[PDB]
Amino acid sequence: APLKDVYKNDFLIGNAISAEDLEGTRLELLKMHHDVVTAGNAMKPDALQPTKGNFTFTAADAMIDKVLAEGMKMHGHVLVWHQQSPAWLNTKKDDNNNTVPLGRDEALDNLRTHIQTVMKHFGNKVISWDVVNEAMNDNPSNPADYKASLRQTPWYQAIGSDYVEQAFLAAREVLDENPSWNIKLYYNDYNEDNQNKATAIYNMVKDINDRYAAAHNGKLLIDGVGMQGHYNINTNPDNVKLSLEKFISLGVEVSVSELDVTAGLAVGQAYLYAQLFKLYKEHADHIARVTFW
């Protein structure tokens, strides 16, 4: 029995792939088991805009056209990240070879231009975008203050703590101009079963959604939270439940975006995969997708 068939009414079953998937023997297993795919590398910022104004969509287009041709859906990953993201977006070299943040006006223009050009280029070919990935520190000591809990990445240093909201606003504008496109906008993070981090993420989303909702008659700016699901055989499943119930109470949908269970035994994986799938089935009304990496 394919996972895809077992969870048909519950959630999409997904996989992360590359170009060499999609060929011959790998292609038939892909389709048999999965409804949705995410490109592992091909839609990241370094692959789509490697120098200023120079968008390179050929390889990504080829991949997405083939996935669509094959009857599967595509999840877009990722518009904004501090890894695999070219320096010119948010920094420059000063006179003495030191890399320094660009000003807020210039970096905000770059941020908005990258989000919007990418989202418009793919249009309705994706079912969802991870607009922002991994913006929160690990184990933040003060999750009551989400802005103080943000990782101080290059976007943060150029724009400040409101770059997350601005990124989602840039993406939301694209969807408002193109209401025929059915696309959910996600915020994505890992170690979501750390209760301080889940709390900081929940407070960030709630503050950003609330202010938006109050100005736009209850519409969400952030549609989804993605739990990456980089778990290990010692991952406590009650922690994953607390976090999931916490994200559900924001009225967002939830997805599991990069599920894998590594060592701290095959048996220990099975223990945890069953506890997780049990928990998902229980909350399937709120979970859109579960994707393995």
Positions marked active-site: 134, 189, 258
Q: Which is nearer to Mg ion, 11 or 190 (CB)?
A: 11
Q: Which residue, among 45, 130, 42, has the nearest Cα to 87 in the 3D structure? A: 45
User: CA angle 52-56-59, nearest 5°?
Assistant: 155
- Which member of 39, 60, 108, 259 binds Mg ion (CB under 5 A)? 60
Closest residue to Cl ion, judged by C-beta, is 58
- Among 7-15, 100-108, 124-132, 205-213, which window interacts with Mg ion (CB under 5 A)? 7-15
Q: Does 56 participate in binding Cl ion (rule CB under 5 A)? A: yes
- Residue 181, Cβ density class (10 Å: 0-12 exposed, 13-18 middle, ≥19 buried): middle
Q: Does 59 participate in binding Mg ion (rule CB under 5 A)? A: yes
Binding partner at 284 among Cl ion, Mg ion, none, C-beta below 5 to 8 Å by kind: Mg ion
- Which member of 3, 27, 59, 284 binds Cl ion (CB under 5 A)? 59
Strand, coil or helix: 273: helix
> CA gyration radius for the chain?
19
The rounded distance, in Å, linking the Cα atoms of 236 and 93 is 45
- The conformational region for residue 191 under phi > 0 = left, psi -120 to 50 = alpha, else beta, is left
Binding mask 228-267 for Mg ion (x = CB under 5 A): ----------------------------------------
Q: Does 58 participate in binding Cl ion (rule CB under 5 A)? A: yes
Q: Does 284 participate in binding Cl ion (rule CB under 5 A)? A: no
- Among 54-62, 129-137, 217-225, 264-272, which window interacts with Mg ion (CB under 5 A)? 54-62
Question: How many CB atoms neighbour CB 187 within 10 A?
Answer: 26
- Among 112-120, 135-143, 149-157, 280-288, which window interacts with Mg ion (CB under 5 A)? 280-288
Binding partner at 155 among Mg ion, Cl ion, none, C-beta below 5 to 8 Å by kind: none
- Residue written as tokens 């979970």? 287
Quick one: CA torsion of 275, 276, 278, 282, rounded to 10 degrees?
140
Cβ pair 186, 129 in contact under 8 A: yes
The rounded distance, in Å, linking the Cα atoms of 117 and 79 is 10
Question: How many CB atoms neighbour CB 74 within 10 A?
Answer: 22
Q: Which is nearer to Cl ion, 118 or 136 (CB)?
A: 118
Q: Does 7 participate in binding Mg ion (rule CB under 5 A)? A: no
Shortest Å distance, C-beta 211 to Mg ion: 27
- Among 57-65, 128-136, 162-170, 173-181, which window interacts with Cl ion (CB under 5 A)? 57-65
Q: Does 96 participate in binding Cl ion (rule CB under 5 A)? A: no
Cβ pair 112, 119 in contact under 8 A: no
The rounded distance, in Å, linking the Cα atoms of 143 and 154 is 21
Query: Which residues are at the interface with Cl ion (CB under 5 A)?
Result: 56, 58-59
Query: Which residues are at the interface with Mg ion (CB under 5 A)?
Result: 11, 56-57, 59-60, 284, 287
